[PDB]
Amino acid sequence: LEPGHAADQEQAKLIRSAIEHTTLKSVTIASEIYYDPDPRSTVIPEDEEIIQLHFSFDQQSPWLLRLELDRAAMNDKDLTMGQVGERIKQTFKNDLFVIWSEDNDEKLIIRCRVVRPAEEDHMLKKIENTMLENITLRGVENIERVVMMK
Amino acid sequence: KGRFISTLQVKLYGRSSARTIATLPYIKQDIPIVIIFRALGIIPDGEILEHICYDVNDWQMLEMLKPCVEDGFVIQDRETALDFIGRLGIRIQYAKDILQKEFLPHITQLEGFESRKAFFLGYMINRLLLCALDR
Amino acid sequence: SLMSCISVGTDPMPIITFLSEWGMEPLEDYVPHQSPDATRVFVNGVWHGVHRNPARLMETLRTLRRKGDINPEVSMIRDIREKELKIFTDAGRVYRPL
Amino acid sequence: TTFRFCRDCNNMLYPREDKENNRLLFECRTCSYVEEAGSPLVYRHELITNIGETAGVVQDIGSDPTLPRSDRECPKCHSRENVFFQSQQRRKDTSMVLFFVCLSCSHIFTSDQK
Amino acid sequence: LPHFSKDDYSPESKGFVENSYLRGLTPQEFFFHAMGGREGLIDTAVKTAETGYIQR
Amino acid sequence: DGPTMREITETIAEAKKKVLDVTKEAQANLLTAKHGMTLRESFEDNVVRFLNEARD
Amino acid sequence: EGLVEYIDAEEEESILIAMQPEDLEPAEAKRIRATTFTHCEIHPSMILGVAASIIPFPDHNQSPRNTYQSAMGKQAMGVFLTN
Amino acid sequence: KPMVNESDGVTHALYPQEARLRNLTYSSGLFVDVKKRTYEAIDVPGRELKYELIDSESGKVFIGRLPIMLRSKNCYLSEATESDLYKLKECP
Amino acid sequence: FNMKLAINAKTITSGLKYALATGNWGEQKKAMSSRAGVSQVLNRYTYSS
Amino acid sequence: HNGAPHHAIEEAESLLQFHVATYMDNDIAGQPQALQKSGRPVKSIRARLKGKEGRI
RNA sequence: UCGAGAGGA
C-alpha cells in the first residue's frame, strides 16, 4: 500500500480494482448480431427509450451488434455503463458509433454500429472478438486473481 | 486383429472465432470434415449436418459447424471431393482406395458401406463438440 | 486381485442376430428427425443399429447372460443420460463377480 | 436463433441485404435461391450459459439406480417419489444446485433460492 | 466407487477416514487410504531422481 | 479411555452436521463466493477446514 | 442359474453395489458405520491381491507399511514345493 | 501331446519333469492338412477369361512345434490326480 | 512342399523358442519391439511368492 | 587407378566418408545408423568416452 | 565379455 495509509481497508480496495486486469469477455452474457437499417427505429422493444435519448457522424451501418451484460458481474468487480461506453468509444470514436443503456435499467445492453460510407456481417464477427479478447478495461495486463492480506 | 496403428485424430482448430475442423493415413495434411462427407457421397450440407447435429433444435452446435462448411465450399460434387491429391502421378483412384481399406478399418473394409462409415465420423465430431461446449 | 479375471474374446455375430430380432434400424438407412430418443447401440465401440425403447431391451438382454445364452464375460451398459448402449466382447477386460 | 436451408439444394444459406428495399434475405451460393428473414438476429455467442443443466433426462430415469433419490414434493402434483442430480453443465465455475426430476409426473423443479 | 451414489459430496465418499487405526479401517476408507499411500511412494521414486541430478 | 472414545465420536458427529449445513447452503445457490477462487473451490476449502478442525 | 454375475470395469459404471449384506438391507464398541442396490459384494477382503491376503489385519496398519510388506513377502524362506 | 524325438531313437514321451531335468523345450507337434491343386487355363492373349477349371502328400504334413503351457487343455497334467502326480515326480 | 517345410518348421519352432526364452515380441533382427518384460522366469522362493 | 567410371567412384567414396565417420561417431546424425551384423551397432570412440560410465 | 531382466538401504 501507499506508505501514507498504514492499514486502510477502502484504500486497499481502490488499488486492487485499479490493478486487476479485466475485459468485456469477463462481463458480457451473450454477443448478438441483429439486422436493423433505420437508426431511429430499432426492431428490439427493449431498445426503444435509449434511442430517442442518445439523439440530440456521417453515414451509418445497417448492422447492429447487441451485447447482454450481467448485473452481478459489473457489481462484484466495480463497473458502470458510463465507463464501459466511453472505453469502447475511445478505441474507435470516428471509426464506430457506440450506444449504451442506462445503469438504472433492468436490462443492460450495448448497441454498436459501423460508420464507413454490403458484406459487413462476416467483417463484424472479427470486430466482436477484438472487443472481448483484446481491448483492456482495468489495470495492467498479465495480472490475474488479486487478493488483500492481513 | 488384421497390427495397423491406424488413428484419425479429428482436430478442432481455433480457441477466438476460427472453429475449423481431421488427419488421415497415409496423408501428411489435415482434411476439413465437409470434404470428407462429400467424398463419402454425402454432398448436401443439410444431410452432412444431420450426421453431426442429431437434435436440430439446439443451435450451439450449428454455430461451431457454420465455418467448417465455407472452408471447403469450393469442393461440392463427389468427383471434386475425391481428387484431393493425398500424396504426384496422373489422382482420384488413390484417395478412392484409401476410403475403402485404410479409412475406418473397423465395422467393414469392403466397399459399399459409405453410410455406415460416415455415421461413425458423424458421431466422432459430435463427441468433439460436446466437450467444446463443456457439456 | 483374487477375484479378478481377464476376457478371452467371444464372437460378436451371435449377439448381433439376437439384437436384430428384437428391434434394430440399419445404419445405412437411419432416420435422425423421425427417431426422437435415439438409443445409439455400440458393439465393441462400433456403431451398428438403433432401438426405440431400450428399457425392455436391456431387461431381455440382462437375463440372456444369466440364462447362459450369452457368455457372462461380455459386458453391456445403458447410458440413459447420453442415449447410448455399449456391448463389449473384446479380449483384455478385467471383471469381478458380484 | 434457428437456421434454414434451400429446398432445391440442401446447402448452407448466406444472408444478403436488400440495399434498395432495406430488408434481410438469406441467399444460396450453389444455386441462386433466396428467402425473406424470419428473425432479425443473425449470430449469437452466449459466453455465460444456463443451458444443458437439465440435459439427458429420458423418462426411463427411474431405471438408473446410481442416481440418489429424494423425499421432496412437486409444486403441482405434490409427488413424494423423486430423483435428482447436480449441474449437467460440466464447467469449472458451475454451482452445486440440485435438479429434482419426478418419476411419475415428468415435471422438473430446482432447489435455487437466489 | 460403484458402492457410492451419483454426485455424493459427503466427506466419507471423498476420502475421509472416521475410524481409528486401533478401531480398524472399513473397505471404503482402506481403498481411499491406499490411494493416499500409492501417491506417496510415487512422490518418493520420482523426486529422488531429480535430486541426484540437482546435487551433481 | 471409555468416555474419551465417545467424546472423539461426538467431535466427528458435530463436524458432519457442520459440513452438512455448508453442503445444503451450496445446493440453494447462496454461498460466500470468496474472491478470485471458484464457488466450488470456496466450498472444498471450507469443508476440508472443518474435517481437519475435528481431527487435530 | 443367474445367481452371480461377472461385472467389467465399464459395466461397473451403471450399477450400485451393497458392501455389507446385513447392514445395507433393513433400516436399523466395534468400528464406525437410496435403497437401490443392484449388486452385492462377496467379501471386502477380496479387493486384496496374493501377498496382501497373507498380511494379518492389513486395515489396522498404515498403507505404505503394507506396500513395503507386499514386495518383502516375496523374499521369504519356507518350502515352495514338496518335489 | 508334448513329445520331443531324440538323436537315433523314437519320439520320447516328453513330460513336465523330464523337460525341467533334461533341459529340453516342452513343445508339442503341429500338423496341417494341405491341399495341392493345379488349376490350368488353355488360352492365348485375348481371349482370355476363365479356366473351366482343372497331390495327397504324406499323412498330415509337419509345420513346427508350439511350446505348450503346464496344466493347459492339451497337457497330461489336466487329466492327472494327486495319487498319480507323486509317481510323475510332480508336486501336487 | 514337405522338403521345404523342414527348414520352415525350424524357423517357426526357433521363432517361438527365441521370443519365449529372451523376451521381445518381434523378429530375431533385435531393437524392433524390444519389450523384455514378456518372457520373465518363474519365481520359486515361497509358494505365495 | 584403373578405368575411372566417374559416377561409380563417388558411390564408393561416400562409403569411405561413412566408414571413417562411424568409427569416430556412430550415435550419429539425423538419418544414418550403421551396425555390425548380427543386429547390434559398433561402439565408436565418441560413445567409448561418452558421459556416465564411459572413460570420463 | 557385451546386452537384457530381477532384486537391495
Add this chain to the structure above:
DNA sequence: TGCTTATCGGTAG
C-alpha cells in the same frame, strides 16, 4: 530451451 530462417511492415532516401 533453446536455436535456426522469411515475412513483414515501416523511414528515408
Add this chain to the structure above:
DNA sequence: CTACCGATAAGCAGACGATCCTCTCGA
C-alpha cells in the same frame, strides 16, 4: 515509391534425467 533494416513469427532437435551394491540368463 522503392530499396533496405530490423521486427516479430514460421519452422523446429537437441541430450541429460539419484549414488552404490547383489544375482541370473542367453546367443
